[PDB]
Design a protein around this ligand. Sequence first.
Ligand SMILES: *C(CCCCCCC)CS(O)(O)CCCNC(=O)CCNC(=O)[C@H](O)C(C)(C)COP(*)(=O)O
Ligand SMILES: *[C@@H](CCCCCCC)CS(O)(O)CCCNC(=O)CCNC(=O)[C@H](O)C(C)(C)COP(*)(=O)O
Lengths: 77, 77, 166, 165
Amino acid sequence: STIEERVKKIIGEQLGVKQEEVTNNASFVEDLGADSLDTVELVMALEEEFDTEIPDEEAEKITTVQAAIDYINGHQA
Amino acid sequence: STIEERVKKIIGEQLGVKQEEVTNNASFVEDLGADSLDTVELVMALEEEFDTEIPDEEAEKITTVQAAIDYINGHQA
Amino acid sequence: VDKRESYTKEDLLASGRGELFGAKGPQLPAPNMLMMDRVVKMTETGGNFDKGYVEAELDINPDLWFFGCHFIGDPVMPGCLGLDAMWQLVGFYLGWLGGEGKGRALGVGEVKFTGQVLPTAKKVTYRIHFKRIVNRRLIMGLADGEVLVDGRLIYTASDLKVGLFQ
Amino acid sequence: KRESYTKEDLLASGRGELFGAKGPQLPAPNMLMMDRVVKMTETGGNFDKGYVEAELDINPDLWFFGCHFIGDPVMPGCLGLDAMWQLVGFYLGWLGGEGKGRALGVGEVKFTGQVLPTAKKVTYRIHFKRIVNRRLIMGLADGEVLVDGRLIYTASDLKVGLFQD
Ligand SMILES: *C(CCCCCCC)CS(O)(O)CCCNC(=O)CCNC(=O)[C@H](O)C(C)(C)COP(*)(=O)O
Ligand SMILES: *[C@@H](CCCCCCC)CS(O)(O)CCCNC(=O)CCNC(=O)[C@H](O)C(C)(C)COP(*)(=O)O
């Protein structure tokens, strides 16, 4: 599962938080310090790294680390 | 590729010309239209492509396609 | 908002008052930060990525305020104001599409200034090529831009980013 | 040479009266985007190749707040970016460089917070990476903009040059 760890790497970089803080059920907005901008850039960073376009309202539902992981899994296989 | 062709490519894109223009005798400013910014950027692009540092006093003498080639082949080809 | 494909200076001054795209739409800056006199073309498709295009102009006159101070005895149009025009135009476009919120520049990738605008010039032209519009809690536009003076390309900006926020 | 400059020194710079007759000028008001230069060193900064720190006091009477935007005042990001270009250029002059200043570009700029008229002070930090002394004298640097101690803008690879004729 390179997926789960690679996604945690991207989230950590984009939201500028520590490796320790990127737990699986952590909320980008509530738990991490993410605003509306960090969130857009986050999803766009996932699109760029893994080569997958997903419309804006497939996103706005990816709110946590589990969601991002879960979502990209299905689109990678 | 050869040192000669990599140097020519960098010169080409940096100065906005394709290879048939980049002749060994071609002078950056007299023949290829470079200004003071283009020449600074060109030599820096050379430093980066060939992973070498060129001092300003040296850079100042790189004014033709052949001089860039000779410089790179001489340090340390 | 009823899309038109071009806008006059009066339309742009109305935009600065909040009276062009309705109160909830973004505003342009008013003078002296407004950096265009008109928008001459706006399309939903077209541009280098076929995802949208805007073209705008600014008339050049030696009495423009910035020539007097940047610099004393050496007038030139500040590059930062050309870049602001491009951010202004991205935000304006988001409004034109119907986006609501306050406009904010978010950043830019590479900017290159290779020539200058002198007070003897006639006209500066801005071209914006849209790459992506994100319609989320934040509305964001991503574009490349070009600035020309009298037909001559002088500035480029990759990955201009502007958003509308609530 | 001095390592810090007052408002009066920066106004002198805009009249071409601080460095040499041949040194670069800062912009005059209303394009001058600092009130003071607090520190300037040849070493130090994140790359140990030069550092500048400067400040701008924030007051609701500043011209740009009235027009950008009416009903929603905020300091234009482009003007904070111009302060960074101004400081890179000022630094080249400070080292004794001759010619007219010109911004050349920047690599990437991110704006993650804003300056409201209720803020007290904006701080600019410039970290030099490289100076090229050729017919064009060019400085390359990273910049940071902070408001009341919080980082809000970053710029990588600010480029400014001093040119003749
Ligand atoms: C004001 C801000 C500059 C801050 C410098 C302060 C130092 C005191 C003037 S602008 O820089 O904003 C002018 C607009 C942007 N840049 C330009 O117009 C210059 C673009 N580049 C060129 O024209 C060429 O590269 C030049 C002439 C510089 C090459 O020189 P060379 O051939 O001798
Ligand atoms: C005005 C010129 C821009 C004109 C473009 C709009 C025309 C309609 C001044 S600036 O936009 O440049 C102010 C520059 C500083 N940048 C900002 O203030 C926004 C920076 N980003 C943020 O503050 C966050 O990303 C926020 C919190 C606003 C994200 O919002 P989100 O949680 O919904």
